[PDB]
Amino acid sequence: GADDEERETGIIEKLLHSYGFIQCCERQARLFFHFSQFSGNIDHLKIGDPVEFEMTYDRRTGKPIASQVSKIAPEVVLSEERVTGTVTTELRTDSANNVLNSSETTGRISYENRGECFFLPYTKDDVEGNVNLRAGDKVSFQIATNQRGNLGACHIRLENPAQPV
């Protein structure tokens, strides 16, 4: 996919009435968004709140607009349980020019917990911190349960590394 999609993140710096500003802090774009382009509780939107929005060119009116603007992790609960897993399979990125471009590759994390033992598919684009984990080290990931009941591995970062000295 990815033929036409721009998932961009921003911070609400100042709320106006029926109008607002998205800050370029995490993305090189300052977009003004209207309250009709916001999905969720506007009364649960605050100054300093980070949101994810889709940047698209509306060919209808001929103006650049934002999509429904999704609050980052609204109904998605981190299960209130932080777990750690052992990397059992890596994914090939981090080339001499491109990285994370190949989203058709995924590794595996094995975590043994709650009597359950199974491998979770993970990609590098969800790996926060921009680290380079390697199979055999120990990483931490937050199991964020979406309202659909379907989830995977998210917030994957390298906490306790295994470096061959």
Swiss-Prot record:
Consequence of substituting R59A: Does not affect association with the 3'-UTR of msl-2 transcripts
Effect of E54A: Does not affect association with the 3'-UTR of msl-2 transcripts
Outcome reported for the amino acid change (mutating Q23A): Does not affect association with the 3'-UTR of msl-2 transcripts
Portion held of the full protein: 186 to 344 of 1039
Domain of life, per lineage: Eukaryota
Record function comment: RNA-binding protein that acts as a regulator of dosage compensation in both males and females. In males, acts as positive regulator of dosage compensation by promoting assembly of the MSL complex, a multiprotein complex that mediates X-chromosome dosage compensation. Promotes MSL complex assembly via association with roX1 and roX2 non-coding RNA components of the MSL complex, facilitating the interaction between non-coding RNAs and mle.
Effect caused by changing Y19A: Decreased association with the 3'-UTR of msl-2 transcripts
Localization (cell): Cytoplasm
Gene from which this protein is expressed: Unr
Known partners and oligomeric status: Interacts with Sxl; cooperates with Sxl to prevent translation of msl-2 transcripts. Interacts with mle; promoting association between mle and roX2 non-coding RNA. Interacts (via CSD domain 7-9) with pAbp; promoting translation inhibition of msl-2 transcripts.
Disulphide bond pairs: none
Protein's name according to its UniProt entry: RNA-binding protein Unr
Family statement drawn from the similarity comment of this UniProt entry: Belongs to the UNR family.
